[PDB]
Amino acid sequence: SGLEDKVSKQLESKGIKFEYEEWKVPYVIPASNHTYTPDFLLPNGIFVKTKGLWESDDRKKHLLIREQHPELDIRIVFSSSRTKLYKGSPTSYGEFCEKHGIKFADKLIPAEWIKEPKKEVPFDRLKRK
Amino acid sequence: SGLEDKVSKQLESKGIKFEYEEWKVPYVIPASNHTYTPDFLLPNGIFVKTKGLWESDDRKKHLLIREQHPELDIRIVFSSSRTKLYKGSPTSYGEFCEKHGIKFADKLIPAEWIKEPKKEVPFDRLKRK
C-alpha cells in the first residue's frame, strides 16, 4: 500500500531496523448460533424456502443445516434455478442443488411434493416464531 | 416476496393447510482458523499494522486477536483515524480504538513508540511467514 511504503521509507530514513510482514499470529473465530426460517411447512412435514437471489453464504448455511439436522426435509423453490452461482460461474443454483442432494423446483411447489406421505417433524428441536 | 405470494396462492387454491414462517431451525456456523500478519515488527517488540479502510470485519478480528494473544503489543497506524466506522456512524476509527484500549497513530509510526524499552516477543507462539 502507499501507506505501508511511507511507513517503510520513514523507518529506513531514520535508520530503524524492522521485520516486514515476517510473522503470523494464529487465532480462532468462535462458532456462532443462528436460526433459519423456512417460508412454508407443508402438512406432510416438508419445509419449503422460496428464493430469488441465492448467495454463497445462503448456500453454506443450507449445507450446515442439512449436516446438523439430517431429519429435516427442507426444499427450495427458486424464481429460477438456472441463475448462475455468480456473474462468471458456469454452474447454476439447480446444479449446486443436485450436487448436494437438495430437492428444488422453480416458481411453484410441485404437486408431487404435496402428495408425498407424511413424516414426523421433531418440533422439540425447533423454535416457534 | 412476489414469489412467496404466488406459492401461497397456489397452495390455498389446492386447499393445502400450511404454516407460514412459523418455525425457526437453529444451526451453528463452525469455528474457523485464521492468522493475522502485522505489517511491521519494531526492534523493541511492538507490532504495527497499517490501515486505510478498517471495516467491521477487520475490527472484530482485531478484538479476537487481542483476547487470544494478550502477550502481544499490536498497534495501528491509520491513513486517517477520523474516518467513520461506516456510512452514517457517529464514531471514528480512533474513537473505537480508545474505547477498546487499542494504541494508534496517523500516517507514520510515532517517534516515541520507536523509543519505548524493548520487550521480548514470544516467537514460539508465532508462525514465520
UniProtKB/Swiss-Prot annotation, chains A, B:
Keywords: Bacterial host gene expression shutoff by virus, Degradation of host chromosome by virus, DNA-binding, Endonuclease, Host gene expression shutoff by virus, Host-virus interaction, Hydrolase, Nuclease. One of its GO terms (molecular function) is crossover junction DNA endonuclease activity. The keyword Phosphoprotein does not apply. GO terms for biological process: degradation of host chromosome by virus; DNA integration; symbiont-mediated suppression of host gene expression. It is an enzyme of class 3 (hydrolase). Transmembrane segments: none annotated. InterPro entries: Phage_T7_Gp3_endoDNaseI (IPR008029), Restrct_endonuc-II-like (IPR011335). Homodimer. This is Endonuclease I.
